[PDB]
Amino acid sequence: MHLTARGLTLDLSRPQVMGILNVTPDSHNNLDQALQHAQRMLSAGATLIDIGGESTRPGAAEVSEQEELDRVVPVVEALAQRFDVWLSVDTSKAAVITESAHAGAHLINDIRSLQEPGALEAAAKTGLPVCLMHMQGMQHSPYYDDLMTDINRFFQHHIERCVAAGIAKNKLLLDPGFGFGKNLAHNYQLLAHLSELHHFELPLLVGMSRKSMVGQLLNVPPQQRVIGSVACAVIAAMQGAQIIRVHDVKETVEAMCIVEATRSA
Amino acid sequence: SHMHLTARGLTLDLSRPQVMGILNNNLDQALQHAQRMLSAGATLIDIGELDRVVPVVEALAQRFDVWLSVDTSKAAVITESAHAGAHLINDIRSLQEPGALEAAAKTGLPVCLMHMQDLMTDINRFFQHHIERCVAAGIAKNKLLLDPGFGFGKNLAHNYQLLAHLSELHHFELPLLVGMSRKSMVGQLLNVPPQQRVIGSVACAVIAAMQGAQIIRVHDVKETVEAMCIVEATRSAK
Ligand SMILES: Nc1nc(O)c2nc(CNc3ccc(C(=O)O)cc3)cnc2n1
Ligand SMILES: Nc1nc(O)c2nc(CNc3ccc(C(=O)O)cc3)cnc2n1
């Protein structure tokens, strides 16, 4: 319905687009490029920017606290001084949660739902809203007896593990984790039954943008997955997903306009 | 009700969303246009003065193996194009032109009705009324297709009121064809020229198909077909 952070509120009356700002290889300072990209997504109509410096697509190895901080935390500083936008950090490290909060992050986006050591206490201590992600968890054929029950149970579990650590239930966001331990069938069943997760009375955030769930249906490169990614965005928005995490902000934002105009007539 | 449609000895499976490419030596450039749409993923090609000898239906009939539809109102243009080898008749003015009602009955190919000026009530009763005529003077019910006529004597508000309530029209147990591609209902929201109206047209199309609309009439075939897989995959998981 709304979000609260660092004095600012965000409107979940209508679907909100989050621009992915990855900071791994930028390809002219690397910060400069990040800032230009951020800028371009704001213009386009994102009202949140997700800053990630973790090569979290399967394989490709891992990252250490010190390396993530150096890559992530400057851009957090830079954007915060520069623009008025919800800034989100996708990280699982207590240190990156800590230092990014000081830097002016508005939202903690954790694909590991604070499972990492002290992450939970670091998160709680910032008083900032947290997004939790269903993951099935290392190379394994995903399987569920019943996918939605499993997602419902996972969230139930982690909402409580958060509410006991001191994070108000209304700091919490839920993301069912498209493409995380989910085959193609699973992803579309989850898309299909998305509206069901509205029962926790928390906002939903979803990320389908240029994922293999579009690639494997349309058999195209990531940069040619714009339309399908958008079509996913439209299907989720019609089921009342509050926040859409995307690469292609301009297209998606236009798309949400049609959705909102349709949800108003 | 799982659906299919048969015409001129050919079958069109309507249990999933179908994309119909709009169409408008210059005859070579049109024939080249069709091919692009065919390879994009069209399964119907909608071909749009007193005399316009359209041998393009003839060209396409002969050239390809794909549904051919024509949006036309006049009593002559319907029959001659069947001679050519068409599969479907698309009329905006729902056969109001003298003769056409009967002219389209002697050719034995599918027909498409289109609404033209409580908004939904008005449309429904209008439709119900007009379906009565077609059974009354020649053509059996399972040969009719229903177009709501987006942007035809309709306010922006209203068009979105329509799109929102589109699922309701499945109570006549006839297939729907919608046309919203690069229309004013999109342009006035997004404040952009037609070429840049792709994404908004595709967004309408998804919203239409999520509501079981079986045929979508588009300028932007590749994008729309792409979008209908995402839609079909979603509806198949259900
Ligand atoms: N909240 C949130 N939600 C996500 O969905 C997400 N995804 C990634 C990147 N993850 C993936 C996963 C799978 C795939 C594929 O199968 O292609 C691609 C990218 C990073 N942060 C994320 N954060
Ligand atoms: N089956 C079918 N269904 C249509 O909806 C359609 N529309 C047109 C073109 N009609 C319009 C009407 C309004 C507008 C605008 O307001 O922009 C644009 C085009 C031509 N053939 C059509 N055929």
Side-chain angles (χ1 to χ4, degrees), chain A residues 1-27 29-54 56 58-61 63-137 140-265, chain B residues 1 3-24 26 30-48 50-238:
Chain A
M1 212 312 167
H2 261 74
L3 263 205
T4 274
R6 294 183 58 236
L8 317 189
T9 303
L10 164 71
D11 181 30
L12 311 182
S13 136
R14 66 187 294 178
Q16 304 296 129
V17 181
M18 170 184 286
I20 287 153
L21 185 54
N22 180 261
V23 299
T24 316
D26 274 63
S27 309
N29 202 327
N30 277 8
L31 211 202
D32 288 5
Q33 292 183 218
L35 290 178
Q36 298 174 41
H37 195 205
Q39 189 59 281
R40 255 154 31 240
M41 301 196 283
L42 272 198
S43 302
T47 42
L48 314 92
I49 312 288
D50 197 66
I51 309 142
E54 183 180 65
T56 259
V63 175
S64 66
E65 275 191 342
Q66 191 41 65
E67 168 66 284
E68 195 175 340
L69 281 170
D70 278 28
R71 78 210 320 201
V72 158
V73 187
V75 20
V76 182
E77 258 266 327
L79 297 158
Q81 188 112 171
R82 247 129 301 218
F83 338 83
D84 194 314
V85 55
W86 280 60
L87 295 172
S88 165
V89 168
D90 81 353
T91 197
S92 300
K93 301 175 162 77
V96 189
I97 287 167
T98 286
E99 307 299 314
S100 297
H102 302 279
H106 301 91
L107 158 66
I108 302 129
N109 173 30
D110 193 356
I111 71 167
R112 289 181 190 84
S113 297
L114 315 169
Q115 253 103 234
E116 291 274 306
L120 179 61
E121 321 205 341
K125 220 131 190 165
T126 69
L128 285 190
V130 173
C131 172
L132 302 177
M133 216 200 51
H134 181 260
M135 209 172 74
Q136 188 181 84
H140 193 199
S141 256
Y143 171 93
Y144 306 85
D145 284 342
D146 181 62
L147 173 59
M148 299 297 284
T149 309
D150 189 286
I151 291 168
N152 272 308
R153 158 175 54 228
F154 171 102
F155 279 144
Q156 194 68 243
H157 171 113
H158 284 97
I159 287 170
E160 297 165 34
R161 193 169 78 86
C162 281
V163 170
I167 299 149
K169 200 200 167 180
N170 75 328
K171 312 254 213 195
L172 292 190
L173 291 78
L174 310 184
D175 176 341
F178 288 99
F180 289 93
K182 291 173 183 70
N183 67 36
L184 187 74
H186 294 141
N187 281 309
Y188 282 102
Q189 146 169 34
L190 156 71
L191 193 65
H193 296 254
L194 203 60
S195 72
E196 295 170 28
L197 311 170
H198 288 316
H199 75 84
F200 292 98
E201 304 165 311
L202 306 169
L204 318 186
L205 187 150
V206 294
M208 285 153 322
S209 179
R210 308 183 175 187
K211 288 200 188 168
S212 66
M213 76 178 277
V214 160
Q216 295 175 357
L217 270 183
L218 306 175
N219 306 304
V220 285
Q223 68 282 10
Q224 301 180 13
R225 296 184 199 161
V226 174
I227 300 287
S229 276
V230 168
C232 291
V234 167
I235 300 156
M238 289 300 292
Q239 289 175 76
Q242 288 88 3
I243 297 174
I244 326 289
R245 180 176 178 281
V246 316
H247 284 90
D248 301 280
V249 171
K250 171 147 195 278
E251 289 81 342
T252 306
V253 166
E254 293 186 344
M256 296 305 89
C257 249
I258 290 56
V259 157
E260 174 66 32
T262 307
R263 286 166 65 89
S264 307
Chain B
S1 306
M3 225 141 22
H4 79 331
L5 234 209
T6 8
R8 209 173 66 45
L10 173 62
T11 183
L12 181 76
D13 149 59
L14 296 214
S15 65
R16 66 187 37 181
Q18 294 291 141
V19 191
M20 161 185 286
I22 308 164
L23 206 20
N24 213 27
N26 316 317
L31 172 57
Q32 189 176 320
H33 187 348
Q35 186 58 305
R36 271 129 72 194
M37 286 187 288
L38 259 290
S39 297
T43 45
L44 312 95
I45 307 292
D46 182 63
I47 309 154
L50 82 89
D51 172 310
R52 52 304 217 306
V53 52
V54 161
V56 2
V57 185
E58 291 196 325
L60 285 167
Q62 291 154 30
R63 252 102 288 202
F64 294 107
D65 176 272
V66 56
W67 276 57
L68 309 182
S69 150
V70 183
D71 42 13
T72 162
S73 281
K74 257 237 198 82
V77 184
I78 297 151
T79 290
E80 202 208 19
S81 50
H83 148 172
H87 307 94
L88 165 48
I89 302 133
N90 184 15
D91 187 26
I92 278 75
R93 295 169 201 191
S94 295
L95 333 165
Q96 302 301 252
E97 293 261 32
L101 176 90
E102 306 200 11
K106 333 197 184 201
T107 36
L109 311 167
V111 149
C112 183
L113 307 172
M114 209 207 65
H115 179 286
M116 214 174 65
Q117 160 147 320
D118 197 323
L119 154 80
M120 295 301 299
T121 305
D122 185 275
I123 293 165
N124 239 200
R125 185 202 61 267
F126 164 116
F127 262 115
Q128 184 80 233
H129 155 302
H130 260 276
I131 318 159
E132 277 150 58
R133 296 202 193 202
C134 309
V135 183
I139 310 148
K141 193 178 181 173
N142 70 286
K143 297 148 195 180
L144 283 167
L145 294 99
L146 314 181
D147 197 330
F150 273 106
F152 283 88
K154 273 148 193 144
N155 197 357
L156 173 80
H158 296 203
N159 277 306
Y160 283 116
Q161 299 255 51
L162 171 36
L163 180 65
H165 294 257
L166 202 76
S167 28
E168 293 157 34
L169 308 177
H170 296 316
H171 96 86
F172 293 74
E173 279 177 343
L174 278 187
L176 326 175
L177 185 173
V178 293
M180 310 158 289
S181 198
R182 298 168 160 213
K183 284 194 194 184
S184 55
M185 72 180 297
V186 172
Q188 290 182 293
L189 269 189
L190 311 185
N191 284 236
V192 291
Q195 169 156 39
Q196 313 148 40
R197 270 173 213 177
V198 186
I199 297 303
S201 300
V202 178
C204 289
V206 164
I207 295 153
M210 279 316 302
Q211 289 177 150
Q214 302 88 342
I215 294 172
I216 319 287
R217 178 181 186 272
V218 303
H219 297 88
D220 303 292
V221 166
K222 194 225 216 186
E223 289 81 350
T224 312
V225 165
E226 283 184 342
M228 305 296 108
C229 309
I230 275 70
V231 165
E232 170 59 13
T234 303
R235 286 156 84 256
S236 280
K238 262 296 186 202

